[PDB]
């Protein structure tokens, strides 16, 4: 139920707030991302071995993960009947 003046003010405020959200040139996004990913790594402790070890296996591309696995999705009618799975 906004009025005309309220709508004009709303358009102006949106246009003003969007321009302040643009990324500033010269921002060191690489170091920022590195810090923002290393911070939760210091605050984390069927069997998929999550946590710091999983992050280590992902960051260090290794051909021998501890628990490799696939999530197989059944295609058709066998996805419902247990025995047909």
């Amino acid at each position: 139920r906004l009025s005309g003046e309220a709508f004009d003010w709303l358009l102006g405020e949106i246009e003003s707030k969007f321009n302040q959200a643009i990324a500033h040139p010269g921002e060191m996004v690489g170091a920022l991302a590195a810090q923002s990913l290393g911070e939760p790594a210091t605050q984390m402790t069927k069997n998929v071995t999550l946590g710091v070890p999983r992050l280590k296996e992902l960051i260090n591309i290794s051909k021998k993960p501890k628990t490799p696995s696939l999530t197989v999705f059944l295609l058709g009618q066998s996805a419902r009947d247990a025995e047909r799975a």
């Binding site: 939760p40 998929v48 996805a79």
Partner: protein, 96 residues
């Protein structure tokens, strides 16, 4: 019978909508469905995807080297992003 380096398979029913099958109904609703899935203990990704009655679209591999070898460099990038998101947001935290 079977495929090598596949030690055993677990039969699973996803109780979370992330692994559930979501298909839009005829009237626009989402109506997430529940379907049987399998969780293996090895990686083939090539003789498994070729198997009949196995979905060749939604089947993932959880291993980035094998996904790189089989599907490509953008597929491995997407899989790596998903693995990182899972391992970071498992505890309930959030990263942009």
């Amino acid at each position: 019978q079977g495929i090598e380096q596949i030690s055993k398979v677990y039969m699973h029913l996803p109780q979370t909508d992330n692994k559930k099958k979501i298909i839009i109904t005829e009237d626009g609703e989402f109506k997430a469905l529940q379907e049987w899935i399998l969780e293996t203990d090895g990686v083939s990704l090539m003789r498994v995807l070729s198997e009949k009655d196995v979905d060749p679209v939604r089947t993932t591999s959880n291993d980035i080297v094998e996904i790189f070898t089989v599907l490509g460099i953008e597929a491995v990038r997407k899989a790596l992003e998903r693995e990182l998101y899972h391992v970071i947001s498992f505890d309930g935290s959030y990263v942009n």
